[PDB]
């Protein structure tokens, strides 16, 4: 049919619940058991890709502007070890010349990896990926919680994401100063423009290893 390429069964955490995603040309459509959305790739503002710190799951995020209750992002689960292989309903010459070489008509590999190549040449944007940060446990992200629920903080190499309820990304560039607040200990951002994010109840030996990242990243500690 008109569809590039069919994903069944996603999982997704915003909203929550499996959904298919049929990719076209120029949208997606977001299909699950009652609801319905169509995403036009011009929508697509970043895309990331996140190692869950249990060490067996991947999200893939995507940042949408407008947003689809609201979600500013669509988020996406995988476990690690799914696999899938695909044929485009193309040409080669076709997939060629629509995606810059990015894509081919058979394809296969990790499940996560596959979805987020596809966009990523879908949507003309780089994928987003964490970059030298660890945590006490040796993870990428740190156990906290924001606005009373449990997630995981991300400092990445340009900014913070916290997933999953609700997400939240923060730019390195939007923040005036950070505060390590008492209660575990409260990681305190303040933006540019007079707000605040507040990632609470992190297990104190995360501390020093957070402190050390944004002295690293030249933020501003006003502590």
Do not use: W
């Not at 992002?73 to 696999?83: A, V």
């Not at 305190?188 to 690293?216: H, M, P």
Request: charged letters at 25%.
């Amino acid at each position: 049919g008109d569809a590039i390429c069919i994903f069944r069964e996603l999982q997704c955490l915003t909203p929550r619940g499996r959904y298919d995603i049929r990719i076209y040309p120029t949208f997606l459509h977001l299909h699950g058991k009652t609801f319905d959305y169509k995403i036009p790739y011009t929508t697509v503002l970043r895309l990331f890709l996140l190692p869950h710190k249990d060490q067996r799951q991947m999200f893939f995020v995507i940042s949408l502007d407008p947003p689809i209750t609201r979600y500013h992002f669509l988020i996406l689960l995988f476990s690690k070890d799914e696999d899938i292989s695909l044929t485009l309903n193309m040409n080669e010459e076709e997939v060629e010349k629509r995606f810059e070489g990015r894509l081919t008509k058979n394809m296969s590999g990790s499940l996560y990896e596959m979805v987020s190549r596809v966009m990523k040449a879908l949507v003309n944007r780089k994928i987003t990926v964490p970059g030298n940060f660890q945590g006490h446990s040796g993870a990428q992200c740190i156990t906290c919680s924001y606005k009373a629920s449990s997630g995981l903080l991300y400092p990445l190499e340009r900014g913070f994401i916290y997933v999953h309820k609700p997400p939240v990304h923060i730019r390195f560039d939007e923040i005036s100063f950070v505060n390590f607040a008492r209660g575990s200990f409260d990681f305190e951002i303040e933006t540019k423009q007079g707000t605040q994010y507040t990632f609470s109840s992190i297990e104190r030996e995360e501390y020093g290893k957070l402190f050390d990242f944004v002295n690293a990243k030249k933020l501003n500690i006003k502590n």
